[PDB]
């Protein structure tokens, strides 16, 4: 796509916020169906304006406020927070210790820079097709646990706009989880003990918890192509020593030779398996995990008041739109073909309206968001109409 010029941002945002931002769908979601007092009215939004000024306890009465206000402030950034005991903007009106964060979707944030020690392709803040597989594996490992382990049914996965993804778990029961539990969910999914620069970072015990097992599996299905072909983790001494490090020193010199007498990583990996297998008679799995398993930041998920990047917001540098990822075609998701605020504004230009976004490249993405919404409606209609019986 055309390289984006962040100088046009002010104008693009104005257009974007007045004709393309999926307001009605954004509202349909955050209002969760009017099944609760002021669930929406008590939702905190945060904004990053003009000179990078940071406004925070913003609130709104209905969908129309949200539109009016946004269009007047044309936010460079928009963040979503918790649902409070009182309308956020009236916190000067609320007593001390009475104003509190009560409900909020469980969220996760996965960033490629949290893997800089396991990727040879790009540089820290960048991403390429060779490292994006990690986001693919992250989404599958994490989304499987949330669904099969915790029974969470509503999970909205979203592209961060540059080098990562976010996940918003919205189950009505989940929005009520205590921080202690969230903090626990994160620990249950965490496996890479990224200590103060400690070479080895994963240790399995003879026994293997099923979550770990099912995780190893998913990884297995991409390891070769991603790790052996794309990353070529065993290409040199400067690379395989890095992997040798995660293996008992009594095995170094042997493998060091096999590696030396090999021609590619797919070969060397196969030697590593063979040799390590003798010794063992888990070393393998640990290496795959240390290179492919997601790294989650406990902070993002622990706090119930955490303000996170809003879906459909615009990335200041890359210009990409924060679009919902379609789980049924995760592997197919391409960060590089993600519509730019510039790109979509141009499409609009080359053409009330209310279906304007549908004539843009956002269309498919907002479609995904709608299905996500249709299911919410169900669960809601399901539980109430069938259980309030």
């Amino acid at each position: 796509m055309e390289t984006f010029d962040p100088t046009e941002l002010p104008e693009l945002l104005k257009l974007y916020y007045r004709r393309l931002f999926p307001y009605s769908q954004y509202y349909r979601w955050l209002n969760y169906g009017g099944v609760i007092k002021n669930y929406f009215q008590h939702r905190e939004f945060s904004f990053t304006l003009k000179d990078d000024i940071y406004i925070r306890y913003q609130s709104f009465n209905n969908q129309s406020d949200l539109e009016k206000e946004m269009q007047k402030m044309n936010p460079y950034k928009i963040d979503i927070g918790a649902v409070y005991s009182h309308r956020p903007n009236q916190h000067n009106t609320v007593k001390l210790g009475a104003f509190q964060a009560q409900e909020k979707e469980l969220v996760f944030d996965i960033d490629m820079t949290d893997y800089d020690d396991v990727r040879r392709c790009c540089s820290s803040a960048d991403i390429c097709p060779k490292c994006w597989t990690l986001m693919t594996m992250a989404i599958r490992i994490i989304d499987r646990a949330l669904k099969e382990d915790f029974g969470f049914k509503h999970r909205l996965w979203v592209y961060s706009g540059r080098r990562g993804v976010h996940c918003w778990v919205c189950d009505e029961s989940v929005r009520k989880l205590s921080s202690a539990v969230r903090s626990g969910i994160v620990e249950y999914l965490s496996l890479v003990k990224g200590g103060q620069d400690v070479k080895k970072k994963v240790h399995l015990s003879e026994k293997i918890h099923p979550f770990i097992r099912k995780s190893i599996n998913i990884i297995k299905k991409y390891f070769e192509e991603y790790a052996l072909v794309n990353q070529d983790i065993l290409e040199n001494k400067e690379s395989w020593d890095k992997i040798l490090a995660l293996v008992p020193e009594t095995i170094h010199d042997e493998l060091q030779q096999s590696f030396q007498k090999s021609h590619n990583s797919l070969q060397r990996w196969e030697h590593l398996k063979k040799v390590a297998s003798r010794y063992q008679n888990w070393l393998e799995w640990e290496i795959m995990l240390q290179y492919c398993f997601p790294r989650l930041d406990i902070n993002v998920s622990k706090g119930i008041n955490h303000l996170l990047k809003s879906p459909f917001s615009v990335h200041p540098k890359t210009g990409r739109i924060s679009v919902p990822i379609d789980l049924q075609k995760v592997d197919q998701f391409d960060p590089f073909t993600v519509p730019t605020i510039s790109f979509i504004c141009r499409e609009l230009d080359a053409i009330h309206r209310t279906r304007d976004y549908k004539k843009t490249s956002l269309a498919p993405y907002v479609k995904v968001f709608e299905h996500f919404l249709e299911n919410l409606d169900k669960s809601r209609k399901g539980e109430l109409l069938k259980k309030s019986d």
Partner: protein, 213 residues
């Protein structure tokens, strides 16, 4: 279940005495603690000879407990010490209890659990056995297992010491209790906090100096 302070009234002697009697029982949990091990009846019966002998008896254990709160709600070493022996005692009280009455306190409680039939048991035996601690063996024994909301098992699943499936934790009855106990330690701790909080409105009283010292 040491909630709801005794509203009754007792002589300064009752108070004065009880305190010392408990300070002894827990002091005994200190003895039967480093001299033995949870070596069945030895550590057991010995503890249960103190139990009845030293008085506690239910209404007696009740008052005794609370009165000692006023005591150890000051030094953290105390609060940790007090909550300590106070626990080993609550476990003991369970141990003995028969399967019949045990089931009551579980239900009569609030925790929403269920027992699984050998049906799901063997089907998940595999998983369950793998979720467990270093728990040697590959047999899901005969000890029945229960299905409780994953949240209620927080201290278990956050360390992957149990199997979650569809938002439920599948645990042995040994573990359901272990949960209820940490819930105790916790609730109690909240109480010692509140007592110390309003201790000041009782420091000045003279009748209470032997105790607080």
């Amino acid at each position: 279940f040491y909630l709801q302070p005794p509203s009754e009234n007792i002589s300064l002697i009752e108070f004065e005495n009880l305190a010392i009697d408990r300070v002894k029982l827990l002091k005994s949990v200190e003895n039967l603690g480093v001299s033995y091990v949870k070596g069945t009846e030895q550590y057991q019966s010995k503890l249960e000879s103190e139990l009845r002998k030293l008085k506690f008896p239910r209404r007696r254990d009740h008052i005794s407990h609370f009165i000692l709160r006023l005591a150890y709600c000051q030094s953290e070493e105390l609060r940790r010490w007090f909550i300590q022996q106070e626990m080993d005692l609550l476990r003991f009280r369970f141990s003995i209890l028969p399967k019949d009455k045990i089931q009551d306190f579980l239900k009569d409680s609030q925790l929403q659990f269920e027992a699984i039939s050998d049906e799901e048991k063997t089907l998940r035996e595999q998983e369950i056995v793998a979720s467990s601690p270093s728990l040697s063996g590959l047999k899901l024994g005969f000890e029945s297992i229960y299905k409780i909301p994953f949240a209620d098992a927080l201290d278990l699943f956050r360390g992957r010491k149990v199997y979650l499936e569809d938002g439920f934790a599948y645990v042995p009855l040994k573990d359901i209790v272990a949960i209820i106990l940490n819930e105790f330690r916790a609730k109690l701790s909240k109480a010692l906090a509140l007592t110390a909080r309003s201790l000041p409105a009782v420091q000045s009283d003279e009748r209470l100096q032997p105790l607080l010292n």
